[PDB]
Paper text:
For this bacterium, Feo is the primary system that transports Fe2+ into the cytosol. FeoA and FeoC are known to be small (ca. 7–10 kDa) cytosolic proteins, while [name] is a large (ca. 80–100 kDa) polytopic transmembrane protein that contains an N-terminal soluble G-protein-like domain termed [name]. The status of GTP and GDP bound to the [name] region is hypothesized to control the opening and closing of the [name] pore and therefore the translocation of Fe2+ into the bacterial cytosol.
To prepare the VcNFeoB NTPase domain for crystallization trials, we overproduced in Escherichia coli a previously designed construct that encodes for a non-cleavable (His)6-tagged version of the protein (i.e., VcNFeoB(His)6). First, regarding AEX, we monitored the 260 nm/280 nm ratio through the entire chromatography process, and noted a normal value of ≈0.6, indicating that VcNFeoB(His)6 does not co-purify with nucleotide, unlike previous reports of E. coli [name] overproduced in E. coli. Second, SEC of either crudely purified VcNFeoB(His)6 (IMAC only) or polished VcNFeoB(His)6 (after SEC) showed only the presence of a dominant monomeric species in solution, consistent with our previous in vitro studies on Feo proteins (from V. cholerae and others) recombinantly produced in E. coli. In order to characterize the three-dimensional structure of the VcNFeoB NTPase domain, we sought to crystallize the VcNFeoB(His)6 protein. Crystals of the apo domain were generated and ultimately diffracted to a modest 3.7 Å resolution in the P1 space group consistent with 8 molecules (dimer of tetramers) in the asymmetric unit (ASU). This oligomerization is likely crystallization-induced based on our in-solution studies. We solved this structure by using molecular replacement coupled with model building and restrained refinement approaches (Rw/Rf = 0.210/0.268), and an analysis of the crystal contacts suggested that the (His)6 tag may have impacted the crystal quality.
Residue numbers in the entry: 1 to 25, 33 to 261
Write the structure that this text describes.
């Protein structure tokens, strides 16, 4: 059975290096490479998504690479999404990981360059990271082809066994959570989390909004204005707080 795998991550996070090591052999050719490798009589079509720092659609140009990647994660179905994070800049790369896990999609966090972090006298509790994120957090180094081969086996087992996904608990605020629950039913029948789609709708992500009827569009529009706090400010603040406490727990100074 053929399995669709999406490799997404920050630019220069090792996301590209993993894809080339695994698969061997468009209009966004910056970071749109499709590859294939076979393991245990099953095929693995991989799509290297452009390196991005956050999720955002475009049509405004200068953001085509980002728009392509954001669109794929939100529409293009995939059996698992390999999110590569560079341990050296841990906090920076986790912003997309938070948005990714919010989608409630099969996810595998692959921590890269863990060896370099040891040299900086920084140690990481990968196990504690797995508990907070609720998704498989695997650690390797994409440079090591030996470790890359070991990763193929872990992925195949994980894909067949099923990816256990413990929903991330965020609680932006009852003020925001009330609005989210009111828009959740519109996105029930999707491929991504209905909750996440409403949050993106409340952030005025036109990509999600354009799939809405004009009437439902006006209903969503009104919710943005009938707020005592700016949606963008509130969402960003909650996301930052979670990231900071997460990093301070799993990290260790010497
Ligand atoms: Mg109200
Ligand atoms: Mg209109």
């Amino acid at each position: 059975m053929k399995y669709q795998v999406l490799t997404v991550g920050n630019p220069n996070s090792g996301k590209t290096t993993l894809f080339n090591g695994l698969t061997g052999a468009a209009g966004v050719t910056v970071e749109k490479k499709t590859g294939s490798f076979v393991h245990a009589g099953d095929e693995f079509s991989l799509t290297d998504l452009p390196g991005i720092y956050a999720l955002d659609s475009g049509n405004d140009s200068n953001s085509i690479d980002e728009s392509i990647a954001s669109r794929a994660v939100l529409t293009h179905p995939a059996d698992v999404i390999i999110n590569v994070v560079d341990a050296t800049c841990l906090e920076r790369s986790l912003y997309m990981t938070l948005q990714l896990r919010e989608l409630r999609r099969p996810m595998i966090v692959v921590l890269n360059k863990m060896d370099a972090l040891k040299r900086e006298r920084v140690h990481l509790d990968l196990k504690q990271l797995e508990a907070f994120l609720g998704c498989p957090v695997l650690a390797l180094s994409a440079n090591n082809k030996e470790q890359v081969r070991r990763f193929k086996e872990k992925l195949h087992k994980l894909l067949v066994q099923g990816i256990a996904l413990k929903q991330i608990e965020l609680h932006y605020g009852a003020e925001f959570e009330s609005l989210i629950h009111e828009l959740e039913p519109m996105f029930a029948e999707q491929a991504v989390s209905a909750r996440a789609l409403a949050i993106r709708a409340l952030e005025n992500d036109r990509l999600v909004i354009n799939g809405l009827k004009e009437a439902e569009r006006q209903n969503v529009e009104q919710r943005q204005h009938e707020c005592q706090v700016d949606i963008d400010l509130l969402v960003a603040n909650v996301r930052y707080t979670y990231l900071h406490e997460l990093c301070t727990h799993v990290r260790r100074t010497e």
